[PDB]
Structures are given as structure tokens and as C-alpha cells.
Curated annotation (Swiss-Prot), chain A:
Belongs to the universal ribosomal protein uS11 family. Residues 98-117 are annotated as: Disordered. GO terms for molecular function: rRNA binding; structural constituent of ribosome. This is Small ribosomal subunit protein uS11. It comes from Mycolicibacterium smegmatis (strain ATCC 700084 / mc(2)155). Located on the platform of the 30S subunit, it bridges several disparate RNA helices of the 16S rRNA. Forms part of the Shine-Dalgarno cleft in the 70S ribosome. Keywords: Ribonucleoprotein, Ribosomal protein, RNA-binding, rRNA-binding. One of its GO terms (cellular component) is ribosome. Part of the 30S ribosomal subunit. Interacts with proteins S7 and S18. Binds to IF-3. The keyword DNA-binding does not apply. The keyword Chloroplast does not apply. It comes from the Bacteria. GO terms for biological process: translation. The chain holds residues 22 to 138 of 138 of the full protein.
Swiss-Prot record, chain B:
It comes from Mycolicibacterium smegmatis (strain ATCC 700084 / mc(2)155) (Mycobacterium smegmatis). Part of the 30S ribosomal subunit. Contacts proteins S9 and S11. This is Small ribosomal subunit protein uS7. HAMAP family: Ribosomal_uS7_B. GO terms for biological process: translation. One of its GO terms (cellular component) is small ribosomal subunit. GO terms for molecular function: rRNA binding; structural constituent of ribosome; tRNA binding.
Curated annotation (Swiss-Prot), chain C:
GO terms for cellular component: cytosolic small ribosomal subunit. It comes from Mycolicibacterium smegmatis (strain ATCC 700084 / mc(2)155). The keyword Ribosomal protein applies. This is Small ribosomal subunit protein bS18B. Keywords: Ribonucleoprotein, Ribosomal protein, RNA-binding, rRNA-binding. The chain holds residues 16 to 79 of 84 of the full protein.
Amino acid sequence: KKNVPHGAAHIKSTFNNTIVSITDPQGNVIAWASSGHVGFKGSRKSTPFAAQLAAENAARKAQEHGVKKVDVFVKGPGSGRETAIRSLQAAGLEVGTISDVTPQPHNGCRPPKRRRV
Amino acid sequence: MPRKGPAPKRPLVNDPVYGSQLVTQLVNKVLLEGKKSLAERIVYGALEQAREKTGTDPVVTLKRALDNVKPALEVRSRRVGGATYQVPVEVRPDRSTTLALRWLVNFSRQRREKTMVERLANEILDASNGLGASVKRREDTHKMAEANRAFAHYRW
Amino acid sequence: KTRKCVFCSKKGQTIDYKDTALLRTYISERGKIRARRVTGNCVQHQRDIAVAVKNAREVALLPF
RNA sequence: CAGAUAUCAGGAGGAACACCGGUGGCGAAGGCGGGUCUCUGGGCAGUAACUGACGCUGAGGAGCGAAAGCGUGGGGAGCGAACAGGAUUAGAUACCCUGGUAGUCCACGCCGUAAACGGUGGGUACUAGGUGUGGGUUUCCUUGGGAUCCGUGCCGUAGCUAACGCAUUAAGUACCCCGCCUGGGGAGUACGGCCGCAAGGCUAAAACUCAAAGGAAUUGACGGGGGCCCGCACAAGCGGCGGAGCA
């Protein structure tokens, strides 16, 4: 295989789930673990417990590829931001730095309209 | 009288034979509701039985057992947002002592010796050494209060 | 703040877009813009500074 | 599952400009906000320099004029009517998801209706204040403060309103002019007419119908409204019942 000394916790933290993609500094997701990856789907995909489970599974894969030092790259808001953060902290990946990597269309494109249920 | 502040409690005297508050609280908890002198005799004989089977002062042995059973975090039954989110709360010394002694009595009456004198003595021994039902329940409650730390910051 | 201004009251000072340091004193970390009354300055200076900050973001000298 | 999500980099696309962004301005009103350039709109302020009553209103008439929609040619990344499956449901056509066509954008056009409302026509002379607040200038301390003229809020005098409220930015006090209504539906409907590719709108009654329709305000029941709270109500401990016989 290979070893990644420093990783990046690219957390696609959708309210649906926190896809914790660990990425080498090159910019390649060496592995990822989401709520479904642990086994959480539907509402359980969006439960806070799924967040630390996904983060911990990703960090276990990180150790499996010898990853210890990771800076945290959290995407948009979801379920279990700080939860996945201290999961990664408690799973062999120290926090390093936290960065809210969220897209900012500064009054740009048009989305769908809305939901009323 | 809740909703108005701390509730005043009935004071507890020490045991006449032994002279310890924990002993008397254990007496009142092993006290089958209706008789005390016979319950006092039963807890007595249990404490002497623990004495020869340990060779030490029964009050100190009971203190060691209570320490080996006293909890530190308690879980209430608050309903938050229609979902059962467990919020651990630090236990005051009196509440933790009461919980430990209640567990000790409940698992004492569970044992299958000839008399609850023997059952309570064996429960005291199994809580002092750390091999009884009370000790394993103390372990399990702390394990479950640590497994749900994500809900521990609610501070209620 | 709470003065007449730092320009309309100090009665000597200027604003330049090339003076990116002076403008940066009023911008946020990313470059976000203070409200019309945050810095306590006379309004015309606020509006001109806002337009200058727009131009600076366009010319790539401030954190946008 | 082919490498979807993701991550990085790149390219393409189309649309809009978050933060500034608010009684703050501008504009006759619809409206105006990424930046640059060009042309242009109007207002306010201090000098009367000047014209020397050239004032106002304004029926007809004039254009402008939200969005939609249609004509013509493009765009379409996304959204997205209409239309597609799935989902609650007795039924979904609906709320929810799974997509997307015209439209939505542009160019040139059409139409003219919106709750196109200070629900307060245009203009002008008087009637306590106070306080935010944009532009200006002056006058008074050593920027500080005052005055003034114009924009723009709220409260509050007189006085007015049925009350609600207006209250020097009137609905108070006066003039002059333009527009409108004469109880409620049937009705901005028939018909004629007018303009319309189309669309519609403008102009618009009547038969018939009822003894009402309505506005302000008062007391009540009504929230998945809140607040203050209190109740072995819950949080907690204990005895338990529901399992069995018996009454």
C-alpha cells in the first residue's frame, strides 16, 4: 500500500449524513466513511450517533494507512459536526485545525423553491 | 415538596450496637416495611457474619462495600423533543449513598441462602470484595453513563 | 464610533483604494462590510468606502 | 457499485450579485442596487445676476407603466408551470420525494390590467412641541455647539374623526381645479361600441332580489400562544395492582 502522514478530514456533513472522506494532502480521498458506511440509513443516517461512528471508522482506516495528524475540513451543516470532530480526535486523528469548507454562492445560482412538510 | 427547593429530610441516628450512619441506613433499607427490631436483628447477624468471614470491623467492611457500590453519575427520565435522550447528572453524596445501599439491599434479598441474615452477609461480602451484583451494577451504570456523553452537555 | 466621524470630525484624513491597509481597518476577516453605523462615521464616507471595497475586491488586493 | 457520494484539479454552461443592504438615499409611479466607461434624468443648498405674473388645476388627449401571457429568433446551468412515477390517505389529482416542457433570461414587439394604497388627487397660504434622520450651507465654543433650507420617522398641541386615528409630512385651518358615489347582490354582467395576431381590458345597464348590507369599538369561548407560576403532576425512592385462589 502506502502511508499518509498528514490527512484531511473532508467531512461532507450533509444533514442526511456526514461522509467523512479522509483525503491525502494531494487532494485524493484515500478512504471515506459515512453514516451508511457504518450502516446508518434513513433517519439513522441523520442521527448524531452516525456522525461519530462514521468519523471513527474513517479514522480507523486512517490508522490502517498510518494516518495520525489530520486537519479537519468540514463541509456544509449537518448532523454531528463537533461529534464527528471528537470522534476523529478519539480515533487516532488529532484535531489539528477546523475549517468550514462550505460553498458560498454569493447571490448566484437559483435553487429549487421550498418545502412545507 | 418539589418545585419549591430542596426537600428537608428526616435525620438518621447511628446504630446502637455498631455506631455508623451507613449501618443504620442499611438497616432501614433491609427493613421490611412493618418490622424494625426483627429487621435490626437480621442486619445485625448479617454484619457479624460478615465480620468473621472478613476478620475486620463490620462498619468498615460496609463502608468499603458502599464505596465499591456508590455511583457517581445518575440518569434521569427527561423527555427531550419526543426522543429519549439520556442526560447524566453528577450525584450528590447522599443520593449516591442511598442508591448504593438500595442496590445492596435489593440484591441481598435476591440471594438464595437459608436466611436473609445469611443473604445480607453474603451481599455485604460480595460488595466489599467486588464480585457481587451490586458491584457489577455499579460498573454497568457508569459504562452506560459514559456511553452517552454526546447528550451529557445538556446540563439539567 | 459615536463621534461625528473619524473624517468629518478629525477634519484631516483621506481614503484611498490603493491604501489597502487603511481600508482593511474597516473590513472583516474575509472582507465582509460593516453596517452603515457600525464604525460611527459620517455616512458619505461609509458609502464611498463601501464602493471602494467593492472595487478592491474586484482588483484582488483585499481578502474578498 | 462501471466508481455514483465525496476530494483535488481542469474545462463548459447560464443566471444573479450575499456581505455593504438601512426610516438611508434616489425615482412621477411601476422601480434602483458587483465593478469600470459613455450619454443622460431630476432635486437641494447660498447671490438676485436676470426675465417681469410667464401661476395652478386640468375634462378630452398623450405616453410611460409589476408580473403573467402571446408574435417573432436565440438561450436553458438550474428552477419550473403543464405533464411524469413513487408517498399519507377511502381517494392524490395535494401537501413529501423522485424529473422535467413552455415559461423563467436576452432582442425586437404586443397588452395595460396588480392589494399599480399615506388605502389620504395636484397646488398653495396659517396651527404647541419633542425626538430620531439624509443633503447642505452658514452662526456661536475650542472638532464642540446654533441657525437655516430641502428629504425622511415616531411620539405628541390645538383642532378634527363614529371611533379607530390624524395630528406643521393632516384627515386641523382655506382657496382653485380635476376624478368618484348615491342601500345590498343580480353586475364592471348583457348588448352595442372601442382598441386585441391572440388574449383581454375600457366604456357598461337592465330584468330580477332583500330590509338589509356595512364600519369603529365592548364582553365573552376558541391556539399545536406565551409568560408567572404552583400540584408523590412529572424527575426520584418505596409499596404495589394487573399472574392465582378466595369474597
